[PDB]
Amino acid sequence: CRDMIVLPEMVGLTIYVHNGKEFVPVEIKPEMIGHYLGEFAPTRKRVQHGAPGIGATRSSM
Amino acid sequence: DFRHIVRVAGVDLDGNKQLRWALTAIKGVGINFATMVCRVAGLDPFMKAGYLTDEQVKKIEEILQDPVAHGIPRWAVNRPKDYETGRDLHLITAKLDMAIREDIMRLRRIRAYRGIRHELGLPVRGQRTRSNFRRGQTVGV
Amino acid sequence: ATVYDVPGDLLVERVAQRLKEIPEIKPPEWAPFVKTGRHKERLPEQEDWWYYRVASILRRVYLDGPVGIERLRTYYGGRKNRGHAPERFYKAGGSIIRKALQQLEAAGFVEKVPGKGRVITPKGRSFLDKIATELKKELEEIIPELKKY
Amino acid sequence: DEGYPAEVIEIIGRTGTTGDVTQVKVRILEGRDKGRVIRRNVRGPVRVGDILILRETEREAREIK
Amino acid sequence: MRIIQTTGKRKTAIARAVIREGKGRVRINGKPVELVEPEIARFTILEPLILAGEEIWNSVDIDVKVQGGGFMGQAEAARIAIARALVEWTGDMNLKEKFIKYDRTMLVGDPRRTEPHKPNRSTKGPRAKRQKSYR
Amino acid sequence: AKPLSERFFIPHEIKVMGRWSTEDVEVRDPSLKPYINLEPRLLPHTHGRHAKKHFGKANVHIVERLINKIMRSGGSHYKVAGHFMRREHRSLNSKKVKAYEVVKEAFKIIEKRTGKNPIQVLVWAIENAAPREDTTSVMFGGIRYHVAVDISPMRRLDVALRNIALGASAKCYRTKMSFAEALAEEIILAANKDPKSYAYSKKLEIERIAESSR
Amino acid sequence: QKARIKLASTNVRSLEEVANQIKQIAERTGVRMSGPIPLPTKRIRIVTRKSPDGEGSATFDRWELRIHKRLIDIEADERAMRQIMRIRVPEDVTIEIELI
RNA sequence: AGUCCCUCCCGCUCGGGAGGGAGGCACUCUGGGGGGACUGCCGGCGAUAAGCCGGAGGAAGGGGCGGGCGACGGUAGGUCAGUAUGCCCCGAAACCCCCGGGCUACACGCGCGCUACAAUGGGCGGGACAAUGGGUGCCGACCCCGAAAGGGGGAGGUAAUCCCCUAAACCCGCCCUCAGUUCGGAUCGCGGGCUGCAACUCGCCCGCGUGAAGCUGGAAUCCCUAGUACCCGCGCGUCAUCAUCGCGC
RNA sequence: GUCGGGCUCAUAACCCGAA
Ligand SMILES: [Mg+2]
Ligand SMILES: [Mg+2]
Ligand SMILES: [Mg+2]
Ligand SMILES: [Mg+2]
Ligand SMILES: [Mg+2]
Ligand SMILES: [Mg+2]
Ligand SMILES: [Mg+2]
Ligand SMILES: [Mg+2]
Ligand SMILES: [Mg+2]
Ligand SMILES: [Mg+2]
Ligand SMILES: [Mg+2]
Ligand SMILES: [Mg+2]
Ligand SMILES: [Mg+2]
Ligand SMILES: [Mg+2]
Ligand SMILES: [Mg+2]
Ligand SMILES: [Mg+2]
Ligand SMILES: [Mg+2]
């Protein structure tokens, strides 16, 4: 349930939120009140770019 | 009578400008809000800023201290329903900057998606990033 | 002489000046703080804009009655600048128009036709046409071609 | 200093790289060779009865096919 | 009591004019013609009356109802209607010959209409097209 | 500002814009005389009915030709005084009312400044701005060369009008001067053969290049 | 005491035939019948891309269906109402009769 | 539109306007049928043919103007991921359903556009004139509430009847006066709404605040011959919600 | 000499900008 809103009674617990392939742990702090759970389980990996390949520029084709 | 420079709430204002536009040099005050405060003070928005008196400057600073208590509607302030106290507040300059910094820091402390976007310096309001938002230099093949 | 015989803007100016003498016309308490619609950017620059809007609405009821809130909202709308997106037409808000119509009815100048809108009373017609006659008298001193009409 | 006027009396044909030029026969109206008929090359639309202002009257265009 | 009716058209604007003996009053949708704005529109309507002359102008009254089109289409349609009414009412051929010399369209009209739009940038026009690229 | 007698102006005679007669206007150049139309007419707006027929523009009143010339952007695909002037959404393309008012205000300024009938001053300017000799291009060995030719009167008229309009367009671009004042200034300068005029200098340059390529 | 007859069809000839037959019936008896009033034609236009794939220059079809209409007024008299009520229009014609 | 009656306004009514009813089909319009243009008439060029060039008259003049309809074939051009179909494969999974993700990532190269770089303007108040289409799983006048977005009731409409629907560019008056500005509005903070089973990933709208690059563009290169191009808004498709697009006005 | 863009069906030659 990524669309569940965090309520004051959930503070202090630990909940494992699905992100597409795995359940990731989220520890509820008081300043989290009012946010969706999915906001704390990113679904994409940060991008670290490599070298541009063949066809990446007009003169490389 | 006329003064070329008038300091209001710790900001140097032009004296040859209309009062309503002169007030916008304060960070936190745009043209609409400045017209509202001029009207509440009982002052002509089109008078030159250099004809002000000391009592008028004091009154303007008092209005800017607490606009809501002086009759400015609660939907016109730049920080309604403050996160800490719950009141309807209006801030200028250093206090405004520190409140914005605190909001971003609070987002970052709980590791919310928006806070991570702030940290990495990437757009935070759902934009596509493949084509535009490029700031750098071309990579070679 | 009638409303049809004089330029509209000059008549609205004269009527707005004459409306300040009627005790039933008073700006609301939120009037100092609002725009006239989502397609505007800045507040009105005249301290007495309420009387101009009221006079325009009265002349509009005279010419096109019976007429209701929604169609007047069409009339007072306009084009909006949307940043990087193209400009578009939008309607005006309703509170100003509804309050002006209620005040005009309180003054006896307009009245309500059920399910149809608001129309000008004989008193309102006389009020407008007298000012139009006065303006036309002044006007034909400098435009002699207006004496035949 | 002010040129000499000449009247177009006959149209010969189009010329130039892109067809923008017309060759004509003109009769001089003023000056030393008043009455002489010569052929000239002109840029722009022209019809019989027009008047040109020649800055000199000793150059004649080569006859075209 | 003579009443004469005439019609004029210009690109979806339609004008119907009525003429009878009067004092020189000309109204357009209820407004005196002397107060029409802008000036360029006002001069469009007034040309036939000035051509006819002050004697004929002051001896009639003209009422014109016009709908459709825009502010320049409506002025020209009213101009056509007024010119046709003036030639029919007074019935003299010097004035008619005067209209044809100054502006033939005053009496014969204008048949032009918009060309329907076509694909490849249809919203812009029948002939304008998208910029072409090869690489 | 503008008096009500001018806001609601009623003319009673057939003359240009109801304000100026062209009865004493003379055209000195014998070549341009049959192409500068001066027949009496009140409103200079023919609704573009002349362009279809060949040589149709000859019988179009000169003031309407000027109005048509200024109804433009100015610098789209070539530079004027060193710049493109692409105005796009704030140009005068297809806005004939604004161009009409620009010409009217320029005429009033001209008449006040010189004391003469504005049509006469405009005629003098176009006479001084009309070139008499031009060039055509040839190619040899990958090099482009000039060859001198004569100019027909209709092209002379068109070029003079275009250059007067472009000069006015350049004088008001991103400066405190207004379009009407710039047009009046350009016309007056061209009438007096001042090299400060764009059209007259252009006229001199064209003739010099044609002369040195015979 | 008057009846209103509404007609519609995709074919002009059949529509004309039915209206003329009703007119003949109204002529065959002493009764006034307001002439068949033509209402504006209803047009259904649909524009579609021609190619099944998305390769090549885009080209379009403009398909149209036209529905014509008529209106007839007659005074409800039984000697005349029986003759009109027993008429059979072709299958491609809609007929609707009401009393006002 | 002319004509009769009733009511209300004005310079107090000799005259001038606005509604409503009786009445009419004149005028506009709607849509069936018909007329009209044929190089027919006149003068030249060509041959005395085929035709071409210029005139009258004309609403229209030389395929009158704008569209539909694309021969025998080729292009091993695109499409089996619209549907049809041979062969080869999977056939307890490569078939059938449910939940959560992704197609929306971001050092960077490119296409087509939108908004600008301001006075051939920005703002504020006032005044003008459209057409195409669409509506019962819907269009909604009119009244009330709210500063706005929006909310609560609801006439009429299965439609030449009711509704979407009082466009913008344009015109008048006042402020700003050549400045990174009263130009530009990207980016971000706080708050208020709508659709939906669901709005974080990943929707649209409103109020206050914030205020990036940009001061006209190298070599190159595109569209267009008349109600055309430029400039300005609007309708329909898609659609629960969402238009910087397509097709049209 | 490096990097990027133009021109060409494409590559080389050629043109432009930049560090
Ligand atoms: Mg408006
Ligand atoms: Mg803008
Ligand atoms: Mg735009
Ligand atoms: Mg078009
Ligand atoms: Mg054809
Ligand atoms: Mg293949
Ligand atoms: Mg291929
Ligand atoms: Mg995709
Ligand atoms: Mg701005
Ligand atoms: Mg405005
Ligand atoms: Mg700024
Ligand atoms: Mg928020
Ligand atoms: Mg979201
Ligand atoms: Mg900068
Ligand atoms: Mg600048
Ligand atoms: Mg698409
Ligand atoms: Mg190469």
Curated annotation (Swiss-Prot), chain A:
Key word Secreted present: no
UniProt keyword Manganese, yes or no: no
BP-aspect Gene Ontology terms: ribosomal small subunit assembly; translation
Alphabetically ordered keywords of this record: Ribonucleoprotein, Ribosomal protein, RNA-binding, rRNA-binding
Origin superkingdom: Archaea
GO molecular function, one term: structural constituent of ribosome
Region forming the signal peptide: none
This protein's GO CC annotations: cytosolic small ribosomal subunit
Family membership noted in the UniProt record: Belongs to the universal ribosomal protein uS19 family.
Function: Protein S19 forms a complex with S13 that binds strongly to the 16S ribosomal RNA.
This protein's name: Small ribosomal subunit protein uS19
UniProtKB/Swiss-Prot annotation, chain B:
InterPro entries xrefs: Rbsml_uS13_C, Ribosomal_uS13, Ribosomal_uS13-like_H2TH, Ribosomal_uS13_archaeal, Ribosomal_uS13_CS
Gene Ontology CC, one term: cytosol
Molecular function in Gene Ontology: rRNA binding; structural constituent of ribosome
Keywords (A to Z) from UniProt: Ribonucleoprotein, Ribosomal protein, RNA-binding, rRNA-binding
HAMAP family: Ribosomal_uS13
Family designation: Belongs to the universal ribosomal protein uS13 family.
Protein name: Small ribosomal subunit protein uS13
Gene this protein is translated from: rps13
Curated annotation (Swiss-Prot), chain C:
Pfam name, any one: Ribosomal_S19e
GO terms classed as biological process: ribosomal small subunit assembly; translation
Keyword Ribonucleoprotein found: yes
Key words of the record: Ribonucleoprotein, Ribosomal protein
Matching InterPro entries: Ribosomal_eS19, Ribosomal_eS19_archaeal, Ribosomal_eS19_CS, WH-like_DNA-bd_sf, WH_DNA-bd_sf
Record bears the keyword Ribosomal protein: yes
Ranges in coiled-coil conformation: none
Domain of life according to the entry: Archaea
A molecular function GO annotation: structural constituent of ribosome
A single cellular component GO annotation: cytosolic small ribosomal subunit
Record Gene3D superfamilies: Winged helix-like DNA-binding domain superfamily/Winged helix DNA-binding domain
Transmembrane segments: none
Function of the protein: May be involved in maturation of the 30S ribosomal subunit.
Stored PANTHER family: 40S RIBOSOMAL PROTEIN S19 (PTHR11710:SF0)
Record text on subunit structure and interactions: Part of the 30S ribosomal subunit.
Family, per entry: Belongs to the eukaryotic ribosomal protein eS19 family.
Name of the protein this chain belongs to: Small ribosomal subunit protein eS19
Organism of provenance: Pyrococcus abyssi (strain GE5 / Orsay)
From Swiss-Prot, chain E:
GO molecular function terms listed in the Swiss-Prot or TrEMBL record: RNA binding; structural constituent of ribosome
Designated gene of the protein: rps9
Organism: Pyrococcus abyssi (strain GE5 / Orsay)
Listed Pfam families: Ribosomal_S9
UniProt family annotation: Belongs to the universal ribosomal protein uS9 family.
PROSITE patterns listed in its UniProt record: RIBOSOMAL_S9
Record carries keyword Ribonucleoprotein: yes
The protein, known as: Small ribosomal subunit protein uS9
GO cellular component entries: cytosolic small ribosomal subunit
